[PDB]
Write a protein that binds this DNA or RNA. Structure first.
Ligand SMILES: [Mg+2]
Ligand SMILES: [Mg+2]
Ligand SMILES: [Mg+2]
Ligand SMILES: [Mg+2]
Ligand SMILES: [Mg+2]
Ligand SMILES: [Mg+2]
Ligand SMILES: [Mg+2]
Ligand SMILES: [Mg+2]
Ligand SMILES: [Mg+2]
Ligand SMILES: [Mg+2]
Ligand SMILES: [Mg+2]
Ligand SMILES: [Mg+2]
Ligand SMILES: [Mg+2]
Ligand SMILES: [Mg+2]
Ligand SMILES: [Mg+2]
Ligand SMILES: [Mg+2]
Lengths: 143, 82, 48, 141, 206, 63, 145
RNA sequence: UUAAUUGCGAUAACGAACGAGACCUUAACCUACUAAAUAGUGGUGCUAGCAUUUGCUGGUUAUCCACUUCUUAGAGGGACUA
RNA sequence: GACGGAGCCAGCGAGUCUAACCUUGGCCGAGAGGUCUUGGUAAUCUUGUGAAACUCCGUCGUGCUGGGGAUAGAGCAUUGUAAUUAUUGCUCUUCAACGAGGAAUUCCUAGUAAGCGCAAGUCAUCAGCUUGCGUUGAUUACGUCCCUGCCCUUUGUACACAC
């Protein structure tokens, strides 16, 4: 019947794909990981800390599979949030740019996405195949 | 500086943080007889902490003593299996 | 109705109470009686 | 050519276009099946017309919905409105009129806003307040 | 019954809950006969709803909210005290969990349980200031069924709220406590205590 | 602790200092043909039903 | 779903950096009790020492506690990036320290002393006990003490 | 009686004016008109992936073809308590 | 309910000429931000303004606590001729009162109150303010003249700057 990323829940797909990436253990982690907050608006760093770069990368991969083209600006806008400015009212602050930039660079080096015309990053053929197969298995885990 | 209040203190319960064999086998023999089991139950009954209660609930559902009917986060709802 | 049902001696009458009331001007005006009238209708000497 | 209609469902500021043709019974939403609308409860709110009229009436037709505007709840209400209206349009153009009457009667007997849009619109904001009717606060001394 | 198939897989869960009979979250609206008269035609059952979230407009006219499903009125009353204003999805989730709990404990239909609670915690007699001016007293009067229902819902939700406040128990299980104790008749529930207080006061001020 | 059901048949008018009270002429369901007048707090209609905790009392009618 | 019973060497209130640190609460927010150590710093050093953060502070070993203390006492030696530090480019030597339990008060106080003996505006302000960050004093800090 | 010296009407008053209302703007309806790569949709070319048995999800500016339900407006209709 | 991850949806609008505005994309930087370019005098580009509250998974567990984040120390940036009585932004650390608020008192009758953020105005920089926009969306009257006032009529007045 055929399947795609759009036929499975996003949480299930992202969890499965992040587990695949963590088990494969080849993508990257820059080195300033286990230090950073992911956002000037966040107050603490991530709680897992045994990963979460693979979660971010899986989310970006699903995002670019859905969309046509994105950039680090769009991803900062998407992953940002309400910065609690103490005693002043909250405000949208966009996420950290180095994180998503290096995520996209690693996704390029592993070959899941490519640079595109009209600027930005786009999903490549082998990356589309990878996400589709991971989605198929993510769906038929329930047997 | 007048506050216009009462400020009555409380008893300050001291729910446990880490368990031992006595609390463990008390759990294992008392999580049955409970028709509804969740973190609130495992704290108003046995004085373990809520974290211990979460872990113990996952554990007991692993074995199969408590049956789940909905495992929505922030509210885990279990009954006893007979 | 209750009285007629609980009454011996049917047909009876249920008699009335009669008292002639005298009010002063102040009390009559306070009690929602002869209240107050326009200069022209003051001359009206009849009842409603 | 194929028998095809296109309808719209609406809410405060959300609109859900719905192409309804003849097919094999796939009901998609923006890219994806109907079981992933993502409030997890307004999912049951959007199943309603199917569950009412019986899924047999969706076996021979393809529905594809594109939603934009508003928020999650309003998008769900627009989706269900568009689905019901597209089904009725198909049964009115291609199926006879008795089935349309029965279907419309069921939809309106369950809920009036399945086929008709809610006429409630935002009241504008007026000065001296944070909202339409509210005023700020009066200070006398 | 037979299961229908489609190009997009529709679960047999929703198929059964759809076509054999129309349920609530996963519960039925039949077998919910109301205990006390005078609240029929003012608590809405026999018009089932899959979820307690209906974007309905019952505020336009006077006695329209009587046709609103009672569970939607409960959800609507559950979201107040500021931070909770709006957020009807959380109220629907709280109600789902509350009915699950009122099924595991007190295996009756939880809808029967809540309507019993409403019937039992409805103040029948209440006081009100009546006077001619300086000579004014709090005189005792009857209470309308719609006000009975509204005051019942308010009392239940407020008791559950100020019980779940500043403690480890959740709003859902506090509401479950309240509803069960109110359906039984307890004098431990905020609702029944307030009800008996008001009725005693009205008796004294006849 | 007995109570009495009573069906509303005629709304007379509002009463009370502030208008939060209504006069009604109820007819008893059991022991029918008895029509007493009562005060009511909340929104009330005819064909509504009230539960009188005390039945042997009439409210001062305003008319 | 992990239930290890425990062995009774668990300890309640312990002592380090001259601070009676509480057990029975996780190590990160336990270490936050140490003046000079916050949530970020404690999370980071407890990551670099490779101690499990799911562990309660009272359930830990003396070697782990000493490793953590050594890290926070000389953090830059363990690849801490020199901008987590409360006293960087200090004022005299130009190196980057990270003050702790009593050194925080002593260093604040000698800063105030420097400014006071210099007769700087902020020092005069601190001496008088007023606000120094340029706030308005007309309606706030009334019963400040 | 009305939101309204708004009306029914009564009538040493008659006939008028201002205000109110009418008016203007805006929000809601139009699968009826005019159309529109500065808004969209469908199909057909080129193309990626999964399924392969037709299919599903997508991309594609000089691939064009067709249309205007959604979007934009302009002219109009519609409610007048029928 | 705070936090961390994922999910992920609006609308009202503004914008460069003799200038230097809104800025995508690429690279560097934990961050703020910097830099090389690009598009747009604008339904076309910024901008689907991928807003926030929200939902789902987990951490926490009734402890002034991972609630709350003022008060202070040090450093890094940006705007501007110039920031010293911090312009603002960012990083770490410090982590105060506050345990729902007394006599009193304000606004509000449906897509309204309330919660939630976004644009514009001022503007070199500085929102906790205002003007509007939309997102989620209750309870309770549909009545009365008791308080506070308004309108008309009759009535009394020793008032006319008029209780
Ligand atoms: Mg987020
Ligand atoms: Mg807030
Ligand atoms: Mg508002
Ligand atoms: Mg609680
Ligand atoms: Mg094509
Ligand atoms: Mg905090
Ligand atoms: Mg969150
Ligand atoms: Mg938009
Ligand atoms: Mg006032
Ligand atoms: Mg501004
Ligand atoms: Mg200034
Ligand atoms: Mg101003
Ligand atoms: Mg009114
Ligand atoms: Mg006189
Ligand atoms: Mg005079
Ligand atoms: Mg005087």
């Amino acid at each position: 019947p055929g399947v795609s990323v759009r036929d499975v829940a996003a949480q299930d797909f992202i969890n499965a794909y992040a587990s695949f990436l963590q088990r494969q253990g080849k993508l990257e982690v820059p080195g300033y990981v286990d230090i950073v907050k992911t956002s000037s608006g966040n107050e603490m760093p991530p709680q897992d800390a045994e990963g979460w770069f693979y979660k971010r990368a899986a989310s970006v991969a699903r995002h670019i599979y859905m969309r046509k083209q994105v950039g680090v600006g769009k991803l900062n806008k998407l992953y940002g949030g309400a910065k609690s400015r103490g005693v002043r009212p909250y405000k949208h602050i966009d996420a950290s740019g180095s994180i998503n930039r290096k995520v996209l660079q690693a996704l390029e080096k592993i070959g899941i996405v490519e640079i595109s015309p009209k600027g930005g990053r786009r999903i490549s053929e082998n990356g589309q195949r990878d996400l589709d197969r991971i989605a198929a298995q993510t769906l038929e885990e329930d047997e | 500086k007048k506050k216009w209040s009462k400020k009555s203190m409380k008893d300050r319960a001291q729910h446990a943080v880490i368990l031992d064999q006595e609390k463990y086998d008390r759990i294992l023999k008392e999580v049955p007889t409970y028709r509804y089991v969740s973190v609130s139950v495992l704290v108003d009954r046995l004085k373990i902490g809520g974290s211990l209660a979460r872990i113990a609930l996952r554990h007991l559902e692993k074995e199969g003593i408590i049956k789940p009917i909905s495992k929505h986060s922030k509210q885990a709802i279990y009954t006893r299996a007979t | 109705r209750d009285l007629s049902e609980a009454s011996v001696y049917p047909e009876y009458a249920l008699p009335k109470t009669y008292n002639k009331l005298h009010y002063c001007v102040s009390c009559a005006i306070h009690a929602r009686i002869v209240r107050v009238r326009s200069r022209e209708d003051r001359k009206n000497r009849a009842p409603p | 050519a194929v028998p095809s209609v296109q309808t719209f469902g609406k809410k405060k500021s959300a609109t859900a276009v719905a192409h309804v043709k003849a097919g094999k019974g796939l009901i998609k939403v923006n890219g994806s099946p109907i079981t992933l609308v993502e409030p997890e409860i307004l999912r049951f709110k959007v199943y309603e017309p199917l569950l009412l009229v019986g899924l047999d009436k969706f076996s021979n037709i393809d529905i594809r919905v594109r939603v934009t505007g508003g928020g999650h709840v309003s998008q769900v209400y627009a989706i269900r409105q568009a689905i019901a209206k597209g089904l009725v349009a198909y049964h009115q153009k291609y199926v006879d009129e008795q089935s349309k009457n029965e279907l419309k009667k069921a939809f309106t007997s369950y809920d009036r806003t399945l086929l008709i849009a809610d006429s409630r619109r935002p009241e504008p904001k007026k000065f001296g307040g944070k909202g339409a009717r509210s005023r700020f606060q009066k200070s006398y001394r | 019954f037979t299961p229908v198939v489609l190009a997009t897989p529709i679960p047999e869960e929703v198929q059964q809950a759809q076509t054999e009979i129309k349920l609530f979250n996963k519960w039925s609206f039949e077998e919910v006969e109301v205990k006390d008269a005078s609240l029929v035609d003012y608590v809405q059952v026999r018009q089932p709803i899959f979820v307690a979230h209906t974007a309905g407009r019952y505020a336009n006219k006077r006695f329209r909210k009587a046709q609103c499903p009672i569970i939607e009125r409960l959800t609507n009353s559950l979201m107040m005290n500021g931070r909770n204003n709006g957020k009807k999805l959380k109220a629907v989730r709280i109600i789902k969990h509350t009915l699950d709990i009122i099924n595991v404990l007190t295996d009756q239909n939880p809808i029967q349980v809540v309507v019993d609670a409403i019937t039992n915690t409805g103040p029948r007699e209440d006081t009100t200031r009546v006077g001619g001016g300086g000579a004014a007293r709090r005189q005792a009067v009857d209470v309308s069924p719609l006000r009975r229902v509204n005051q019942a819902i308010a009392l239940l939700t407020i008791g559950a709220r100020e019980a779940a406040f500043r403690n480890i128990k959740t709003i859902a299980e506090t509401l479950a406590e309240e509803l069960i104790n109110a359906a039984k008749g307890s004098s431990t529930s905020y609702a029944i205590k307030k009800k008996d207080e008001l009725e005693r006061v009205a008796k004294s001020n006849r | 602790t007995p109570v009495t059901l009573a069906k509303v048949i005629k709304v007379l008018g509002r009463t009370g200092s502030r208008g939060g009270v209504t006069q009604v002429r109820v007819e008893f369901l059991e022991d029918t043909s008895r029509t007493i007048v009562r005060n009511v707090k909340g929104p009330v209609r005819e064909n509504d039903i009230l539960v009188l905790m005390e039945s042997e009392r009439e409210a001062r009618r305003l008319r | 779903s992990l239930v290890v019973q425990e062995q009774g060497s668990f300890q309640h209130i312990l002592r380090l950096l001259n601070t009676n640190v509480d057990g029975n609460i996780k190590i990160v927010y336990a270490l936050t009790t140490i003046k000079g150590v916050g949530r970020r710093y404690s999370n980071l050093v407890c990551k670099k020492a490779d101690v499990d953060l799911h562990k309660r502070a009272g359930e830990l070993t003396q070697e782990e506690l000493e490793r953590i203390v050594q890290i926070m006492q000389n953090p830059t030696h363990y690849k801490i990036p020199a901008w987590f530090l409360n006293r960087q480019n200090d004022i005299t030597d130009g190196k980057d320290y990270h003050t702790l339990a009593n050194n925080v008060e002593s260093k604040l106080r000698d800063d105030l002393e420097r400014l006071k003996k210099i007769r700087a505006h902020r020092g005069i302000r601190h001496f008088w006990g007023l606000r120094v960050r340029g706030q308005h004093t007309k309606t706030t800090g009334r019963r400040r003490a």
